[PDB]
Design a protein around this motif. Structure first.
Motif, PDB file in Angstrom:
ATOM      1  N   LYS A   8      34.539  12.676   8.415  1.00 52.45           N
ATOM      2  CA  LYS A   8      34.672  12.215   7.013  1.00 52.45           C
ATOM      3  C   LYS A   8      33.304  12.201   6.290  1.00 52.45           C
ATOM      4  CE  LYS A   8      36.810   8.373   4.246  1.00 52.45           C
ATOM      5  NZ  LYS A   8      35.980   8.626   3.033  1.00 52.45           N
ATOM      6  N   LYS A   9      33.151  13.076   5.282  1.00 54.64           N
ATOM      7  CA  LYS A   9      32.014  13.039   4.327  1.00 54.64           C
ATOM      8  C   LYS A   9      32.431  12.370   2.996  1.00 54.64           C
ATOM      9  CE  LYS A   9      29.306  17.094   6.042  1.00 54.64           C
ATOM     10  NZ  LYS A   9      30.005  17.178   7.350  1.00 54.64           N
ATOM     11  N   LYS A  10      31.429  12.053   2.155  1.00 51.36           N
ATOM     12  CA  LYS A  10      31.646  11.442   0.829  1.00 51.36           C
ATOM     13  C   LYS A  10      31.942  12.526  -0.238  1.00 51.36           C
ATOM     14  CE  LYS A  10      29.440   7.474  -0.152  1.00 51.36           C
ATOM     15  NZ  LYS A  10      30.041   8.050  -1.384  1.00 51.36           N
ATOM     16  N   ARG A  23      43.117   7.280   3.913  1.00 46.05           N
ATOM     17  CA  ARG A  23      44.279   7.260   4.834  1.00 46.05           C
ATOM     18  C   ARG A  23      45.616   7.284   4.046  1.00 46.05           C
ATOM     19  NH1 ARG A  23      46.531   2.720   9.434  1.00 46.05           N
ATOM     20  NH2 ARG A  23      48.040   4.144  10.242  1.00 46.05           N
ATOM     21  N   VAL A  24      45.715   6.440   2.996  1.00 48.11           N
ATOM     22  CA  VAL A  24      46.935   6.328   2.153  1.00 48.11           C
ATOM     23  C   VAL A  24      47.227   7.659   1.413  1.00 48.11           C
ATOM     24  CG1 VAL A  24      48.143   4.947   0.330  1.00 48.11           C
ATOM     25  CG2 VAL A  24      46.405   3.829   1.796  1.00 48.11           C
ATOM     26  N   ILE A  25      46.153   8.334   0.934  1.00 54.87           N
ATOM     27  CA  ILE A  25      46.253   9.664   0.284  1.00 54.87           C
ATOM     28  C   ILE A  25      46.974  10.676   1.204  1.00 54.87           C
ATOM     29  CG2 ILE A  25      44.945  11.691  -0.658  1.00 54.87           C
ATOM     30  CD1 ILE A  25      42.707   9.748  -1.489  1.00 54.87           C
ATOM     31  N   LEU A  26      46.416  10.868   2.412  1.00 53.09           N
ATOM     32  CA  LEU A  26      46.965  11.795   3.423  1.00 53.09           C
ATOM     33  C   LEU A  26      48.377  11.372   3.896  1.00 53.09           C
ATOM     34  CD1 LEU A  26      43.688  12.528   5.565  1.00 53.09           C
ATOM     35  CD2 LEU A  26      44.740  13.942   3.715  1.00 53.09           C
ATOM     36  N   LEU A  27      48.622  10.053   3.958  1.00 49.76           N
ATOM     37  CA  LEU A  27      49.899   9.482   4.445  1.00 49.76           C
ATOM     38  C   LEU A  27      51.083   9.856   3.517  1.00 49.76           C
ATOM     39  CD1 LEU A  27      51.254   7.732   6.667  1.00 49.76           C
ATOM     40  CD2 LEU A  27      50.662   5.665   5.298  1.00 49.76           C
ATOM     41  N   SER A  54      43.545  13.536  -6.282  1.00 52.44           N
ATOM     42  CA  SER A  54      43.669  14.992  -6.024  1.00 52.44           C
ATOM     43  C   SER A  54      42.358  15.595  -5.481  1.00 52.44           C
ATOM     44  CB  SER A  54      44.088  15.741  -7.308  1.00 52.44           C
ATOM     45  OG  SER A  54      44.217  17.146  -7.082  1.00 52.44           O
ATOM     46  N   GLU A  55      41.225  15.208  -6.097  1.00 52.16           N
ATOM     47  CA  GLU A  55      39.877  15.653  -5.670  1.00 52.16           C
ATOM     48  C   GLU A  55      39.600  15.278  -4.193  1.00 52.16           C
ATOM     49  OE1 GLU A  55      37.892  13.374  -8.869  1.00 52.16           O
ATOM     50  OE2 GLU A  55      37.279  15.233  -9.853  1.00 52.16           O
ATOM     51  N   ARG A  56      39.826  13.990  -3.845  1.00 51.58           N
ATOM     52  CA  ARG A  56      39.537  13.464  -2.485  1.00 51.58           C
ATOM     53  C   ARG A  56      40.492  14.050  -1.427  1.00 51.58           C
ATOM     54  NH1 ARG A  56      37.326  12.095  -6.308  1.00 51.58           N
ATOM     55  NH2 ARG A  56      35.665  10.639  -6.565  1.00 51.58           N
ATOM     56  N   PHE A  57      41.762  14.284  -1.811  1.00 48.64           N
ATOM     57  CA  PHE A  57      42.744  15.027  -0.980  1.00 48.64           C
ATOM     58  C   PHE A  57      42.173  16.399  -0.541  1.00 48.64           C
ATOM     59  CE2 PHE A  57      46.045  18.503  -1.669  1.00 48.64           C
ATOM     60  CZ  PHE A  57      46.547  18.492  -0.381  1.00 48.64           C
ATOM     61  N   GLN A  58      41.705  17.167  -1.530  1.00 47.16           N
ATOM     62  CA  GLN A  58      41.183  18.528  -1.319  1.00 47.16           C
ATOM     63  C   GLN A  58      39.836  18.524  -0.553  1.00 47.16           C
ATOM     64  OE1 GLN A  58      42.193  19.307  -5.803  1.00 47.16           O
ATOM     65  NE2 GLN A  58      42.472  21.307  -4.866  1.00 47.16           N
ATOM     66  N   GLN A  59      39.080  17.405  -0.642  1.00 50.17           N
ATOM     67  CA  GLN A  59      37.856  17.200   0.166  1.00 50.17           C
ATOM     68  C   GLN A  59      38.243  17.026   1.646  1.00 50.17           C
ATOM     69  OE1 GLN A  59      34.318  17.132  -1.713  1.00 50.17           O
ATOM     70  NE2 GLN A  59      36.032  18.403  -2.318  1.00 50.17           N
TER      71      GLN A  59
END
Length: 70
Positions: A8-10, A23-27, A54-59
């Motif tokens: 996990k990076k920022k 975790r909730v995003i991916l879940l 959406s941005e953090r999902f694609q990260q």
């Protein structure tokens, strides 16, 4: 899908994101499907806007594929 992950990076500079949010995003993304209305559910859940989610999902995806070292 392996049991947990430590890769996990920022994906942000001045925005509040922690291990519990990503975790909730991916879940809900795997439960439902990565759509604007799923990002809107995760928005209201994580105090964010659909854009932020959406941005953090694609990260997260690109971190599991490449990750790398910058």
């Amino acid at each position: 899908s392996h049991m947990k992950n430590v890769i996990k990076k920022k994906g942000e500079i001045i925005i509040l994101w922690t291990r519990n949010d990503d975790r909730v995003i991916l879940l809900e993304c795997q439960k439902r499907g990565p759509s604007s209305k799923t990002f809107a559910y995760l928005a209201a859940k994580l105090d964010k806007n659909p854009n932020q989610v959406s941005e953090r999902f694609q990260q997260l995806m690109k971190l599991f594929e490449k990750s790398k070292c910058r």
